[PDB]
Ligand binder design. Structure first.
Ligand SMILES: [Ca+2]
Ligand SMILES: [Ca+2]
Ligand SMILES: [Ca+2]
Lengths: 80, 100, 105, 98, 99, 80, 106, 98
């Protein structure tokens, strides 16, 4: 079972709503999943790189924060 | 003897007001977590994840895609529309500079 | 008090900053006026945001700042928005904004 | 025992400033992680810029001058003006202090 | 009667012309007087390296060149061929230059 | 008379022609001058601040190339 | 007896090592660091000069120019990404007209 | 009148590499102008990333490891593989030279 499907249609609507979206194509869900799947693969490829360099087997919040700042999308409240 | 139903749109507009009012995480946390490990494995197996690290992943995913919807809605409205679509997404992402 | 931060009149740590600039690989050397100057800058930007968020908490009948009160103080002040343009504020949400061509008549 | 390595933060000075600007309000730890990240982000911005300034003029030393300049590069209009107003006020007050 | 082209097929030449070449497409002297006039607000009596103004112009062109590649995709999305201030205003808002 | 207009309708056209544009609203020209002028104001603000910092009365190619690295518009082939 | 020749590298192992020490990157610098870095900066230099030099030959020319650089880079998937926010001077754009602005039935 | 001051450049090295790759292929001055900004930019990036890696592991020293890591971080896929290949070779050859 590909977990990705676990990103439910009803979650994807809730996000969109927050974005001021009122009506939505049904096709979107499959595009929102691959978009989402890209975004993570990039960030976790980075997060796991820092981790691999620190020699650990545990990915930290710092491993994510450094990956997100490399990716342009800097994040506050998990240790800047 | 009235069955008073809402018109196709009005619970979309409430649902907006609501979730823009709130800050809580809108993907269900367990599915996200497992997915995150299913992505990770493709680089390194047998990986452990701080709880807060996986929150730091989600917090980013949602606020990314929240953003991506905002812009994707402005792509729809541009096209004289109100339904968002795959071609609204992909334009935002192109103009954002995410794919060739 | 004997400490530099008390010399400049500044809450933020002069001494800490001055050590961090040495240990942070910026330049071979660092003047005694640099960390003072930087400490006062980091104090102000704190002080604006805490003044504005501290009022966003006084908008919600709270006495405690949360990640939302920051987000609102931030995205509604134009200048801080520009400063924090690439910045994800966790548990901040978004600003309340629905387009006109989605509303009813 | 006595673990956790001794980790540093600005959280006490966020608290000291907070009580100046609003004595009678306080702040969540979630909110203090944003404030601490924020300080750490701008710190890193202003020092990396001042680094380059000094590098570009072949200057070894990072003076108050390099920061003044790097402030003006990073902050926008009215936020920059004040920043320089305050930081110059600190060095004038501290050169008095000896 | 004389020959005339179909309103569009010369623009299509103009496109294939200018994509093929690399020269600067603004008038160099005007660009320079503007630049100096912009600058002089930030500091009077400035001088300029000729290479500096030609660096500024190389970026100015290639940014706007890209803004129109964008602004055209914005226009085509609205099933249009004519670029419009809205298309520019969108590309700029989606780029985060504007908000 | 304040230069801005010197960026000619013919010029603006030519740029757009490079950039895939087959048809050009008449209000574009004035818009694009607002755009170009803002873009310059900000690049030049930076380069001149670098100038002011090097204690100089002449702007250099580098003052520019540095300024455009800070605006994210890394320019190759004029130093650095 | 030189370091570049000891590594087999046309780039300067030394200069790169100096540059490292002087660029305020870290307090200290390993002895592989500059060998590795130079070697990478060899290969990325080499990967463009090939493609650029193809494009130059595909313009029937001898001497590579900013155009023959831009082409090679924007027509390679990877490199394009690598220099995604990099204005190459005097290099132009690729020839590209979106197909909804072509001729009807051609 | 005086000599002009030194302005270093990679341009001999770029030529050396260009002549391996395409022996009958020259290069303009502007083209070299670019290839120089090219390297110097990718130095600034790889060093900068390796600088942050060490600082995140509290390491004083940028070794050959912090480069390789930063190379994987910054380059695209097949670009990075060969880049990891040729740098790994480089240090291997220099250590067995002594
Ligand atoms: Ca030293
Ligand atoms: Ca004036
Ligand atoms: Ca004027």
């Amino acid at each position: 079972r590909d977990n990705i499907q676990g990103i439910t249609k009803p979650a994807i609507r809730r996000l969109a709503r927050r974005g001021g979206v009122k009506r939505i194509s049904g096709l979107i869900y499959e595009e929102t999943r691959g978009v989402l799947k890209v975004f993570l693969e990039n960030v976790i490829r980075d997060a796991v790189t820092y981790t691999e360099h620190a020699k650990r087997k545990t990915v930290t919040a710092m491993d994510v924060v450094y990956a997100l700042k490399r990716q342009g999308r800097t994040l506050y409240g998990f240790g800047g | 003897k009235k069955p008073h139903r809402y018109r196709p749109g009005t619970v979309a507009l409430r649902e907006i007001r609501r979730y823009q009012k709130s800050t809580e995480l809108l993907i269900r946390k367990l599915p996200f977590q497992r997915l995150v490990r299913e992505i990770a494995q493709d680089f390194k197996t047998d990986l452990r994840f701080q709880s807060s690290a996986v929150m730091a992943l989600q917090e980013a995913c949602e606020a990314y895609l929240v953003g991506l919807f905002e812009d994707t809605n402005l792509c729809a409205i541009h096209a004289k529309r109100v339904t968002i679509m795959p071609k609204d997404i992909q334009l935002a992402r192109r103009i954002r500079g995410e794919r060739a | 008090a004997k400490t530099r931060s008390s010399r400049a009149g500044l809450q933020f740590p002069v001494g800490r900053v001055h050590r961090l600039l040495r240990k942070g690989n910026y330049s071979e050397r660092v003047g005694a006026g640099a960390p003072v100057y930087l400490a006062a800058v980091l104090e102000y930007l704190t002080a604006e945001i805490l003044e504005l968020a501290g009022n966003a908490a006084r908008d919600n009948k709270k006495t405690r700042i949360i990640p939302r009160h920051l987000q609102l103080a931030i995205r509604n002040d134009e200048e801080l928005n520009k400063l924090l343009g690439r910045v994800t504020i966790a548990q901040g949400g978004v600003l309340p904004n629905i387009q006109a061509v989605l509303l009813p008549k | 025992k006595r673990k956790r390595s001794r980790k540093e933060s600005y959280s006490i000075y966020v608290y000291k400033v907070l009580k100046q600007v609003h004595p009678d309000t306080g702040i969540s730890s979630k909110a203090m992680g944003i404030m601490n990240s924020f300080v750490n982000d701008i710190f890193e911005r202003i020092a990396g810029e001042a680094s380059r300034l000094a590098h570009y003029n072949k200057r070894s030393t990072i003076t108050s001058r390099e920061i003044q300049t790097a402030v003006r590069l990073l902050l926008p209009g009215e936020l920059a003006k004040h920043a320089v107003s305050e930081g110059t006020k600190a060095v004038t007050k501290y050169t008095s202090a000896k």
